[PDB]
Ligand binder design. Sequence first.
Ligand code: HEM
Ligand SMILES: C[C@]12CCC(=O)C=C1CC[C@@H]1[C@@H]2CC[C@]2(C)C(=O)CC[C@@H]12
Length: 398
Amino acid sequence: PNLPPGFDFTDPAIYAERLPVAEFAELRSAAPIWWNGQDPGKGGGFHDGGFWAITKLNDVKEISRHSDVFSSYENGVIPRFKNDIAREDIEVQRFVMLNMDAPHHTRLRKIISRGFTPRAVGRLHDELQERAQKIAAEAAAAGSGDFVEQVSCELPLQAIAGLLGVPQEDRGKLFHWSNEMTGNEDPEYAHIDPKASSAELIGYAMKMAEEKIVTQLIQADGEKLSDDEFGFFVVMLAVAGNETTRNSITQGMMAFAEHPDQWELYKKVRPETAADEIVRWATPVTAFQRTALRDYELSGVQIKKGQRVVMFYRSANFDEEVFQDPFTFNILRNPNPHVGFGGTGAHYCIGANLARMTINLIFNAVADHMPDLKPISAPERLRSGWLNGIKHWQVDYT
Ligand code: HEM
Ligand SMILES: C[C@]12CCC(=O)C=C1CC[C@@H]1[C@@H]2CC[C@]2(C)C(=O)CC[C@@H]12
């Protein structure tokens, strides 16, 4: 492929500035499965020499379905940490369901599904609709500001608070922890320590479990979460369901600003297809990885036991063989077989319907209260090699 020597698709230096869209396109054309070498000390906490870059939608789906071969446990699924991270600090992440394999995963997912029934999620609708309307009304009243802080941040957090039934008075500290929980190497957040925050959040969760959806999770059925498993569950929600949905909202609104005919159409009909096009466009999770438990032949490439494969959802969601005009933002996109929520399989995002609800509610409220919003200046991108994040974005709400 035509790429610079030493190029690394997980390099946080790239994501601080841009998405490497041209480079992913080059792989899909010239080398759709490509060994991405990493030199010593430059592997984002991994010291195995590199990973297979997976750029095609059908390959990502194949990996995701074959969790019997492609493990989330052996190396976790986050493909990029600070270069100096201790191995122990990666391995401790195996205590969240996301980074477990069957049968352990199977048991926890079965229990935790009690929190994501369409009944549990559907019950949040009216409180989240109310919140979304008030958020959008207060942003409009401010006239201008940081869209991320004023519009994108709060509703995901309130969706988590509401699912868990957190008392109103505790939501401030919960949101504080939650916002320091996902690791990044951004200089704006160099003072944050996800370790301290995670200990404190687990402590708060376990006390909540002691004092008692939380009920359904900790009451025996005799399967239940232990108090510590409930703590780990709450940490996982903070990493899985916060900045993900937030970045879908920011990048969805960036796409509307860049595609005004789509925003006009959205404002009229609020179509059913919008939320998934927003998620495909935004691809909040750029990439998650797996580790081969045995040799496996994938589209003619001989993947070897113990090797990492990185599923670039950001490539796969723009796969020209699957999506007509993939670089066109189309809120009526159909079909839309995107992998923003992952490939179908054991680990497929359990919060996907909650995320869609959150997106629809906030975008309805934005259309209602700020139909003429326009950007003032450029989005500020997060320095992360796996999260596709916007830290700030100044906009004129009127
Ligand atoms: C637009 C927003 C979101 C995006 C893009 C997103 C994306 C993802 C992806 C890519 C995965 C891994 C799938 C796989 O490995 O096959 C995942 C898993 C997960 N997500 Fe989401 N997610 C979002 C919102 C949420 C929300 C709102 C919640 C809950 C509050 C949530 C909870 C989870 C959990 C608990 C898992 C782990 C599932 C497992 O390992 O079995 N996510 N998500
Ligand atoms: C918050 C965290 C780090 C930053 C990041 O990006 C992802 C995670 C999720 C798993 C956490 C971990 C911090 C340490 C935790 C709390 C444990 O001791 C068990 C699970 C693990």
